[PDB]
Amino acid sequence: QNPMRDLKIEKLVLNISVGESGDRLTRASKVLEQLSGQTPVQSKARYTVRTFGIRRNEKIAVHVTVRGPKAEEILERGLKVKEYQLRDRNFSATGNFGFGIDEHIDLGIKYDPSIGIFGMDFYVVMNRPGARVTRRKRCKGTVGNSHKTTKEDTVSWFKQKYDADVLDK
Amino acid sequence: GKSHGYRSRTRYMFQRDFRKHGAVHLSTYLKVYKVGDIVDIKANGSIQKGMPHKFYQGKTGVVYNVTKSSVGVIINKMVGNRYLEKRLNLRVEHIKHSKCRQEFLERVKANAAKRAEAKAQGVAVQLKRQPAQPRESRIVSTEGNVPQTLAPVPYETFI
Amino acid sequence: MARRPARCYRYQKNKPYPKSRYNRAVPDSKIRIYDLGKKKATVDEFPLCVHLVSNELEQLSSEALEAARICANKYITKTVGRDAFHLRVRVHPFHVLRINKMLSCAGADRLQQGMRGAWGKPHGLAARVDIGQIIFSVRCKDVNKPVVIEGLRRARYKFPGQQKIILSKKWGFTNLDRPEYIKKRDAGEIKDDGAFVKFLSKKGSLEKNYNEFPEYFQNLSA
Amino acid sequence: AKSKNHTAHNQTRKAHRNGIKKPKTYKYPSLKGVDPKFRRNHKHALHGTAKALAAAKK
Amino acid sequence: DAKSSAYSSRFQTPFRRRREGKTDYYQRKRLVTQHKAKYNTPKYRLVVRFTNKDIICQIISSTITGDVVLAAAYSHELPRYGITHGLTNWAAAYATGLLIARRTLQKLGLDETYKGVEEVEGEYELTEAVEDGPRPFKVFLDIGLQRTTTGARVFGALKGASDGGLYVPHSENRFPGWDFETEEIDPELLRSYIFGGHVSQYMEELADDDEERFSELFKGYLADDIDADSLEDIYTSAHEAIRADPAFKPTEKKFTKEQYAAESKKYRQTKLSKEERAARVAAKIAALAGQQ
RNA sequence: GCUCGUAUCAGUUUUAUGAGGUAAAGCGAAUGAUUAGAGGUUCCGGGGUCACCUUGACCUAUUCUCAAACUUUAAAUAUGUAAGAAGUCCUUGUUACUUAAUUGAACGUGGACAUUUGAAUGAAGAGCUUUUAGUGGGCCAUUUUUGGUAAGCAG
RNA sequence: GAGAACAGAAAUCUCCAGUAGAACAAAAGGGUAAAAGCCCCCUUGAUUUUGAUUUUCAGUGUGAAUACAAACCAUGAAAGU
RNA sequence: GGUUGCGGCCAUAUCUACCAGAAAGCACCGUUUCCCGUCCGAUCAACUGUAGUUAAGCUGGUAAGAGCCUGACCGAGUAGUGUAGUGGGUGACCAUACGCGAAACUCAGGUGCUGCAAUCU
């Protein structure tokens, strides 16, 4: 039909939320470094809540974005514990999806002291080639309705790749 | 505490008219102003440096000074019992040409052109403008337009 | 503290002074129900529409609306039944009236400063009313015309000024005259909307029009 | 005690009794408030043309 | 979704070229504005745009009805002057700035003076005025949307114009190899960039390393069997060729404009009139009412 | 009094060109309020069948009424400028200004500009200065309008 | 609005829509969307000399503001500010 | 005539859905040694027009399309208003005379034109 209209992974964002600031953040930073091979950024607190122990501007989370073949490798090793199967939910209206895990330190690499055990959050941003047309500075436009991504297109791509299946529930 | 600020009673004067907010079109800058050109002040509230006073909205005056990014205009002011010559230093965003002059200019050229022709053939080309003279006589035919009879409509409630 | 006579506030002397972010301590309007009778009633059933029309320019207190609303409803429902009419109050009391309270006790000059600071505190609500507008609109069946006349002529006594009852040529609460409305209703042009009707427009998406008014198009092909 | 604080009554009648006359504009207006760069360039231009006209009339 | 009618009514669209995103008006607003005491004098913009596969450079002065162009110089015509492949590279960007600088100077009649630099040793040297002569032509670099960045090709053409006898103000800040610890530019490193040193060094590295990518990329250079050392030669030969004849020889223009219109119109979608619109709805209304 | 003698003028109209945001109009235009419904929900509560009768709002298409401190639009009257010899047109001279320039700007030199010297009407003389008196408690009337219930009330 | 372990109406991330319904130190109004908002980078022009002008106005002051000149700087790649 | 770059008027140009796109252009598209910039070559920067694509952008077309624009003897000379009266009305307001004169509604049409330069079956 059309070769390049096929979907591809754009970016995975590897999200983690930490209540406080301290050594937990430091080990949270470095576990993501040994996770992705690139340093993460400390997403900074936005407001005060008085119930989550949050003042404004206290850097209460860690995330990192992975793209390219390293993204293909890192989602595979992340979805293996997910078992290449996933709930019929979790798929956004744009077809992006995500889910959470409970540990990474000894999931794929050897565990070492003074790092703790952290659950965290995956989120995959998947869009077909041509995404620059809505991100470039000059001649910025949109993406046509056909070029958009939907649930059925994404879940179908989820099938043919990894031979995965949805709706394990 | 009565207020007489530099922008008082100016909620609507410095508005940006509907669907024309934002930046200003660039023909405002590319317009050329020479000293002596009659111009009329219209304050574009988008640009805040060098705004005119509220009294100067819609006033018209000649240009006596042209500066780096502004022109200087001479306005006549209603004060007491005599006019005073006011000098304003206004950004070009707040000023535009007065189209009254160009109509005088084009009429003069046509008036000059008629004078050149009346010099050669047909002198006394009636140079001066004549306002709407009273209608001259005419014949209004009835052919196919017989005067239909009209009567006032009876009053009814419409409600 | 008791209410003043209405002739104090009859004329439209002041500019509209509605409840707003600048006018916060406004008392609630006494009138609260504006549609009465079988209000969930369709349009075809009540062809007759009669209006209580003001011929004068004044202020009608919110309470006077409520009084006439009660008396007009009570009489008509007792005569022709609750479900035989739909009475609708047209005007809404948004103008806030102001009162300057004067102490009526002996020695009041000491505790009160006359009109130093005479800005009256909000006193009540009224509807500013003009010439030829509609105050009440009652739609009903042609049968029960005289009852609504008496109902609407028994409400005028509770309103200041000189009102008039005039029956309308418009079909109920529509803007269309009776023959013009029936032309559309005969030609499937009209869809009931609970208390009013939507008219098919010759402008807009033809798909939506066909979905909303299939009967008109079917009659076109017959 | 209390007195009429302000009024514009009779002001326009006063203003027009002697009339509001235009400022009687003059040829060669006041060369003031102009751009200084223009002004004392204009000085030298007027100097130069004066010498030229003076030599033209000899 | 569900764009409301009130939103459509109240939506003030930006200027057409802002809607397309091609023009940054806030920046043009201060380029094309001119010192009001310079009433009629145009303010020329040296506009450079890096579309894919071509470089667009032109000199533009604003009028009331629209921008007028003195003379333009693109990279499509560079094969005439000897630059064949990689018409988008940094070295070509320098050359096309040189070409337009030569072109405009000869169109204005100021070719004989302000030769810029005949020998390009890559040092920051503006084109100053000569003693008692016409001033150097002053044009202003309107890069447009693309970000200012050290070593960007947009400032490659900047160096091209300023080395072409055309006075465009600038600082050595954005030229490639601009050190931060010290404010010295590297003449050797620029001269490499002028002649493709950042390209020829990738020629030889890949050629020394492998042949797969070296044969995939740079295919036209392999077709002419030209080595990296010849890249400097061809760029020089272009420079003196540009300095020899910048007179803007156009193309041959076969199948001329009326014919160009003729073929386009056949494959050009037309617009219906009221009669077609009346007919189309009548057929559609009948179809939807035809026992549906 | 002075300088001059039909004007560089005008509490005016017309032509043209603007300026405003009141009246009115508007809420199936934004904002704030508003009466009536009609049709459609995620497990971000069904409170009872856990999807089965019972509702938990919002969105859509309408509908009624509004607004001094809301408004798309938008008057009337009032208001600014112009309606020429201090102008128009042509030529080439100055500048330390400006331009890439012998490019422009400003000031000009010379030369052509009566049926009407460039809209109407009028001008009663026009313009300018000096000096000084009194006054600096106001009040009424149509219209507009604020506070007040209103006032031969106050503003 | 759609979603995503812990995480729920609300802690962080991503997408779509989003004419401004936010922010702009502080009253209200005006004004601003590749910005006047947010984040980052660099700086002191919040400097000197005086004058001219606008508002209040007696065309006085004070305050505030506008546009320039001569500098000298800042910033930018520059126009420019 | 199409396309590009720079624009003018700044929606008759916008917005929602679908359709078509010969040639050329544009664009997506490919690779990080260099400059450069990021959590990430996604943006930016560089290198190649080569490996491909019209899917998208873009252009145009379609919609009794929303919107927007113009006009109407459409509403309506209506609301409103200037002037006048020893007009009416207790008043509220209204009528009339001489003038100016809308807005909403209704209907009709339309849905970019163009400047400079270059390029293209």
Side-chain angles (χ1 to χ4, degrees):
Chain A
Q1 191 268 331
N2 206 321
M4 61 76 87
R5 197 172 169 261
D6 192 348
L7 290 174
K8 47 157 186 54
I9 301 300
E10 182 46 287
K11 82 189 61 173
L12 283 72
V13 65
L14 278 296
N15 193 343
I16 309 95
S17 309
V18 181
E20 81 301 330
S21 306
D23 175 50
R24 207 156 198 209
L25 280 191
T26 72
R27 60 190 186 170
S29 70
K30 70 182 181 69
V31 63
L32 274 294
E33 293 179 353
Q34 63 214 60
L35 175 148
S36 70
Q38 69 210 254
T39 177
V41 292
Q42 297 293 321
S43 79
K44 192 176 286 184
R46 210 184 310 107
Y47 294 91
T48 59
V49 287
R50 195 266 312 156
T51 313
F52 306 141
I54 297 169
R55 265 71 171 161
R56 293 185 83 250
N57 297 115
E58 53 159 286
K59 296 201 62 203
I60 62 170
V62 296
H63 65 270
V64 67
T65 290
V66 190
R67 324 153 169 280
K70 173 61 171 289
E72 281 256 20
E73 181 265 329
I74 191 167
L75 64 95
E76 171 284 337
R77 57 167 318 298
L79 192 83
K80 67 179 175 65
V81 66
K82 190 48 69 177
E83 192 146 30
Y84 301 167
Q85 47 76 32
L86 195 150
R87 184 178 210 177
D88 56 349
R89 194 61 31 61
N90 303 323
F91 276 69
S92 65
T94 307
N96 306 116
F97 72 99
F99 48 89
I101 62 170
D102 203 6
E103 63 92 10
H104 179 83
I105 308 93
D106 61 358
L107 189 149
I109 54 174
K110 163 205 64 60
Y111 177 95
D112 61 357
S114 294
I115 191 167
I117 299 149
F118 292 162
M120 61 80 70
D121 189 358
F122 303 160
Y123 210 80
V124 178
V125 181
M126 176 185 34
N127 63 7
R128 63 196 83 239
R132 181 177 201 251
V133 71
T134 175
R135 298 305 308 287
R136 57 201 183 157
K137 184 81 167 303
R138 178 168 179 281
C139 193
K140 172 178 300 319
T142 45
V143 290
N145 283 120
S146 89
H147 203 85
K148 313 297 269 154
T149 62
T150 43
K151 295 186 71 73
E152 69 275 16
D153 291 331
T154 46
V155 301
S156 308
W157 166 98
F158 204 82
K159 308 310 181 299
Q160 287 69 240
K161 182 175 173 65
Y162 293 99
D163 217 328
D165 72 326
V166 75
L167 183 62
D168 62 321
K169 78 171 196 61
Chain B
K2 280 183 171 286
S3 66
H4 285 49
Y6 200 80
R7 273 195 54 170
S8 47
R9 310 175 185 150
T10 309
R11 174 212 270 281
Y12 303 119
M13 221 165 288
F14 289 4
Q15 289 279 151
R16 295 308 311 285
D17 68 4
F18 184 99
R19 284 178 26 220
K20 314 285 302 290
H21 293 238
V24 311
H25 46 88
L26 270 284
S27 179
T28 294
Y29 293 100
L30 277 296
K31 269 161 187 316
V32 60
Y33 298 108
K34 302 168 67 199
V35 167
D37 291 331
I38 193 66
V39 300
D40 53 288
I41 297 96
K42 153 63 194 168
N44 165 282
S46 304
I47 314 302
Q48 296 78 7
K49 304 270 287 182
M51 294 182 286
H53 194 238
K54 62 180 164 64
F55 171 79
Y56 284 89
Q57 203 44 230
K59 293 297 174 24
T60 302
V62 303
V63 174
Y64 81 113
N65 173 23
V66 188
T67 50
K68 172 179 76 40
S69 63
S70 81
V71 307
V73 292
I74 309 282
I75 318 296
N76 277 37
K77 176 147 197 206
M78 186 66 204
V79 61
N81 74 299
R82 75 221 181 300
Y83 288 132
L84 294 174
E85 291 316 90
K86 317 298 270 160
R87 295 143 190 286
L88 277 296
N89 312 60
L90 292 174
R91 293 296 182 107
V92 294
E93 301 76 329
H94 308 128
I95 193 66
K96 76 177 182 292
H97 278 280
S98 170
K99 299 159 46 174
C100 73
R101 212 50 185 162
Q102 59 70 22
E103 183 178 1
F104 174 64
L105 294 174
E106 61 86 20
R107 181 167 59 75
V108 164
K109 307 321 292 153
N111 186 306
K114 282 156 58 183
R115 208 181 279 290
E117 182 46 287
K119 269 275 192 172
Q121 278 74 241
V123 72
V125 75
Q126 191 37 252
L127 280 299
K128 291 189 167 194
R129 266 171 319 164
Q130 283 313 0
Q133 297 279 270
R135 283 186 283 278
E136 81 176 40
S137 84
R138 58 210 47 202
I139 281 293
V140 184
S141 64
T142 300
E143 321 275 10
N145 193 255
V146 62
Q148 52 76 30
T149 288
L150 187 153
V153 285
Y155 153 80
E156 81 206 90
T157 61
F158 303 150
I159 292 156
Chain C
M1 280 212 73
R3 195 185 89 188
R4 285 190 176 170
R7 44 92 161 171
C8 278
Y9 308 113
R10 182 180 178 191
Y11 313 149
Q12 291 195 29
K13 294 213 81 53
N14 294 329
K15 295 186 174 84
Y17 185 58
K19 186 176 183 175
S20 66
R21 73 191 210 71
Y22 309 105
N23 291 318
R24 296 182 279 179
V26 176
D28 180 337
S29 180
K30 292 298 189 182
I31 190 167
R32 185 42 31 70
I33 297 89
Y34 303 71
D35 303 358
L36 300 101
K38 184 152 151 292
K39 94 173 71 63
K40 293 332 300 162
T42 80
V43 175
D44 285 0
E45 65 183 1
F46 296 146
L48 182 61
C49 182
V50 73
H51 298 305
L52 185 71
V53 183
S54 66
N55 171 20
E56 69 276 16
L57 189 155
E58 70 276 16
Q59 304 192 355
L60 280 53
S61 179
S62 72
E63 212 276 339
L65 277 298
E66 183 59 10
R69 182 207 64 69
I70 291 168
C71 76
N73 188 359
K74 284 282 261 163
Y75 153 80
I76 301 167
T77 187
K78 294 192 251 193
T79 312
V80 294
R82 154 62 31 80
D83 291 331
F85 74 76
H86 174 184
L87 161 54
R88 189 170 63 171
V89 176
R90 297 290 287 183
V91 298
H92 291 73
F94 299 133
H95 185 64
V96 183
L97 277 297
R98 296 190 302 276
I99 188 170
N100 188 359
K101 84 151 81 163
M102 295 296 172
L103 291 175
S104 61
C105 55
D109 190 68
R110 299 182 178 177
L111 296 175
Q112 180 160 24
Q113 303 170 3
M115 300 146 197
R116 183 171 290 171
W119 178 258
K121 185 272 171 153
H123 186 273
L125 294 176
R128 324 181 51 61
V129 299
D130 301 326
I131 302 299
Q133 65 183 357
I134 302 299
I135 297 169
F136 289 173
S137 303
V138 184
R139 68 178 177 123
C140 64
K141 176 43 161 183
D142 291 331
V143 175
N144 63 6
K145 185 183 286 185
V147 64
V148 176
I149 300 299
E150 201 46 23
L152 277 181
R153 184 261 281 290
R154 200 176 297 244
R156 74 160 50 221
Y157 294 101
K158 316 272 261 173
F159 283 170
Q162 188 274 331
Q163 287 77 63
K164 293 182 183 293
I165 308 105
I166 62 170
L167 61 93
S168 187
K169 314 163 271 283
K170 306 302 182 181
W171 187 280
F173 295 161
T174 74
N175 298 336
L176 304 184
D177 298 8
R178 285 183 159 205
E180 181 155 339
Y181 155 72
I182 289 159
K183 300 289 94 176
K184 284 183 151 63
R185 175 210 51 181
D186 173 58
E189 211 66 1
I190 297 169
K191 154 73 81 193
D192 277 339
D193 193 29
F196 194 50
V197 285
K198 294 178 186 174
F199 300 104
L200 176 64
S201 66
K202 308 301 181 190
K203 184 162 81 43
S205 171
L206 182 62
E207 189 277 331
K208 291 187 179 182
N209 286 348
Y210 182 76
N211 189 359
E212 201 66 340
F213 300 88
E215 51 285 30
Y216 153 80
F217 295 97
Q218 290 175 353
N219 290 340
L220 188 153
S221 59
Chain D
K2 279 195 80 152
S3 44
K4 183 222 270 180
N5 314 95
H6 178 77
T7 187
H9 203 249
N10 210 52
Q11 295 321 300
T12 61
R13 162 144 57 259
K14 274 208 308 181
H16 290 117
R17 196 165 303 225
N18 264 357
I20 190 167
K21 287 300 303 312
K22 270 163 184 73
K24 192 63 199 212
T25 61
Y26 285 130
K27 184 198 276 189
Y28 292 164
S30 180
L31 190 159
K32 70 176 180 95
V34 307
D35 214 14
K37 182 161 311 194
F38 173 92
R39 179 193 310 211
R40 80 291 184 276
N41 172 40
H42 196 235
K43 216 178 70 65
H44 303 118
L46 269 294
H47 281 347
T49 187
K51 311 310 185 67
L53 295 188
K57 63 93 175 179
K58 299 178 175 196
Chain E
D1 185 66
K3 205 53 91 173
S4 64
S5 166
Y7 168 89
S8 288
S9 168
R10 295 179 50 86
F11 187 77
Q12 160 187 1
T13 59
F15 303 147
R16 167 172 49 79
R17 278 184 67 75
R18 168 73 195 82
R19 297 194 255 117
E20 314 194 0
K22 289 175 197 265
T23 295
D24 172 30
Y25 270 94
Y26 176 84
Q27 155 184 330
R28 166 182 197 74
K29 181 179 178 294
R30 57 198 56 232
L31 276 296
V32 305
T33 188
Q34 160 73 321
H35 198 299
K36 299 289 94 175
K38 314 191 174 161
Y39 313 88
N40 305 317
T41 70
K43 186 179 279 292
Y44 298 99
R45 305 210 317 293
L46 188 153
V47 160
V48 286
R49 303 290 189 262
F50 301 121
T51 176
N52 314 310
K53 306 167 187 181
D54 195 349
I55 312 307
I56 296 169
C57 186
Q58 62 205 319
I59 295 308
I60 283 160
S61 60
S62 281
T63 62
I64 301 299
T65 178
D67 286 324
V68 300
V69 177
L70 310 190
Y74 315 88
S75 278
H76 72 256
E77 66 259 57
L78 282 194
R80 165 180 180 237
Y81 305 111
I83 308 168
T84 296
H85 322 274
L87 301 165
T88 319
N89 58 58
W90 191 108
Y94 168 87
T96 193
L98 181 67
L99 165 57
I100 185 171
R102 298 321 287 170
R103 185 154 295 163
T104 187
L105 270 291
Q106 75 104 23
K107 294 292 194 30
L108 302 172
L110 287 84
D111 53 9
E112 81 305 338
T113 194
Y114 299 124
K115 272 83 74 172
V117 287
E118 185 73 283
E119 323 299 331
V120 188
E121 270 90 334
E123 294 89 13
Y124 176 73
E125 322 279 355
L126 289 169
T127 51
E128 301 88 345
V130 303
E131 319 296 306
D132 196 303
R135 288 193 289 175
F137 198 53
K138 175 170 61 216
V139 74
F140 299 116
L141 178 65
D142 193 353
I143 76 176
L145 272 296
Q146 53 283 50
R147 291 81 181 287
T148 182
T149 305
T150 298
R153 284 158 310 161
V154 61
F155 312 128
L158 161 53
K159 181 84 169 169
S162 187
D163 291 331
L166 183 62
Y167 181 75
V168 56
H170 65 273
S171 304
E172 62 163 2
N173 184 13
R174 293 312 192 190
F175 287 157
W178 159 259
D179 198 345
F180 297 148
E181 306 297 325
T182 183
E183 291 46 50
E184 54 81 20
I185 198 65
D186 188 356
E188 213 55 37
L189 184 60
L190 276 296
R191 210 162 61 62
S192 69
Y193 274 74
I194 301 299
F195 302 109
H198 74 306
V199 170
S200 77
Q201 190 154 357
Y202 194 52
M203 294 298 291
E204 294 294 328
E205 187 271 338
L206 279 189
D208 287 328
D209 180 78
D210 78 324
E211 212 76 15
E212 181 260 319
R213 304 295 303 170
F214 179 83
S215 58
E216 161 166 24
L217 312 168
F218 294 100
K219 192 69 186 72
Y221 306 100
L222 263 58
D224 211 357
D225 303 68
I226 48 154
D227 293 325
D229 60 358
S230 56
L231 296 205
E232 177 199 37
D233 189 4
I234 58 171
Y235 280 134
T236 62
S237 69
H239 292 324
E240 288 94 7
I242 286 176
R243 287 216 168 82
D245 182 22
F248 178 52
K249 189 45 176 49
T251 60
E252 93 276 5
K253 202 46 72 175
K254 64 91 176 179
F255 191 76
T256 180
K257 305 256 184 185
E258 314 87 8
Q259 293 80 321
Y260 277 134
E263 176 76 1
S264 299
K265 279 206 215 155
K266 299 289 94 176
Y267 293 99
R268 198 42 178 121
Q269 284 215 281
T270 183
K271 186 200 287 289
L272 316 187
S273 75
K274 179 178 62 60
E275 300 216 38
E276 287 108 350
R277 179 152 293 98
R280 181 161 295 181
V281 65
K284 168 152 169 202
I285 197 166
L288 269 296
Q291 314 323 106
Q292 308 308 305

